[PDB]
Amino acid sequence: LFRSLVGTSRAIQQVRQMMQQVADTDASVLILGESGTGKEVVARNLHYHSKRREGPFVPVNCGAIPAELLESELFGHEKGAFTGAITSRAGRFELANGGTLFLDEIGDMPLPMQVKLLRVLQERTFERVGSNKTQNVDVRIIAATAKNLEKMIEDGTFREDLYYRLNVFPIEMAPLRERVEDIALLLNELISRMEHEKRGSIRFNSAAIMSLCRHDWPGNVRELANLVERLAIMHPYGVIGVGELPKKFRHV
Numbered sequence: 001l002f003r004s005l006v007g008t009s010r011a012i013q014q015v016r017q018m019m020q021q022v023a024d025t026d027a028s029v030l031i032l033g034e035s036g037t038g039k040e041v042v043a044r045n046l047h048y049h050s051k052r053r054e055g056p057f058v059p060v061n062c063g064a065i066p067a068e069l070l071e072s073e074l075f076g077h078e079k080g081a082f083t084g085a086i087t088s089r090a091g092r093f094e095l096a097n098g099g100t101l102f103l104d105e106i107g108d109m110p111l112p113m114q115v116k117l118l119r120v121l122q123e124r125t126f127e128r129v130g131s132n133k134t135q136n137v138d139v140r141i142i143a144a145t146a147k148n149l150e151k152m153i154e155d156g157t158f159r160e161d162l163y164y165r166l167n168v169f170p171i172e173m174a175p176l177r178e179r180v181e182d183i184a185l186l187l188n189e190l191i192s193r194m195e196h197e198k199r200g201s202i203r204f205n206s207a208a209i210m211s212l213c214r215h216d217w218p219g220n221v222r223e224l225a226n227l228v229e230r231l232a233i234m235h236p237y238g239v240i241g242v243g244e245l246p247k248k249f250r251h252v
């Protein structure tokens with residue numbers, strides 16, 4: 001199920017080298033890049049080539065989780081912690097023990113939780129909400145952001161100390177529009193997925209590929225994948241020329 005990073009560009013070949021180097025280590029990894037540039041693919045790949053490969057891979061979607069329950073969600077809770085605690089759950093961190101914790105959009109993590117994350121990176125311990133008992137954790141952190149963390153540091157919306165703790169081995173994902181030589185290969189890979197998964201089939205003629213190579217791709221590879229899916233419904237087992245592209249994708 002593991003995905004590979006497809007592409008021949010300078011930038012993507014560089015990311016593969018960096019991945020191979022850091023994967024087997026226990027260093028924290030910060031992956032930086034726009035939405036849809038492969039940051040989670042990079043993260044999953046790092047994990048399954050790590051010492052922790054058979055351990056759990058636990059995502060944390062920093063922006064989504066209701067702030068009311070953020071600390072509970074991340075660190076678990078004991079009972080009578082808060083209104084309607086009742087049951088019992090452990091948090092994302094405890095669940096990730098012996099594995100990898102993946103902090104998707106770390107730029108959205110609120111300051112109070114940044115302090116607590118810094119404790120885990122530094123003391124490798126934590127306490128469930130309500131309990132002042134201390135638990136050891138054994139996790140490797142991989143974080144990703146589309147934000148400018150150094151701007152945030154300046155704005156005081158991101159902690160400098162967490163930053164230097166997390167940014168031990170940064171990996172930059174170039175946006176699609178800077179890797180346009182990879183677009184054909186990405187197309188083949190995406191079409192191959194869709195075929196292997198009984199979800200239709202298409203192929204692009206050279207003109208249509210030229211047109212796509214001139215596109216800005218604000219949604220990067222996720223936007224590319226979206227377009228392949230739509231075209232396979234609009235023109236099943238068809239060949240996509242310039243004229244079958246939606247007008248926004250035409251650049252001639």
Ligand SMILES: Nc1ncnc2c1ncn2[C@@H]1O[C@H](COP(=O)(O)OP(=O)(O)OP(O)(O)=S)[C@@H](O)[C@H]1O
Nearest residue numbers: 003004005006034035036037038039040041221222
């Ligand atoms: N180089 C690549 N080779 C193959 N598939 C890729 C590549 N880059 C991205 N993908 C795929 O395109 C999609 C992009 O997914 P992600 O890796 O999650 O993007 P992202 O950078 O994590 O953006 P967010 O934070 O989830 S909005 C996934 O379906 C990936 O499998």
Ligand SMILES: [Mg+2]
Nearest residue numbers: 039040041104
């Ligand atoms: Mg993701």
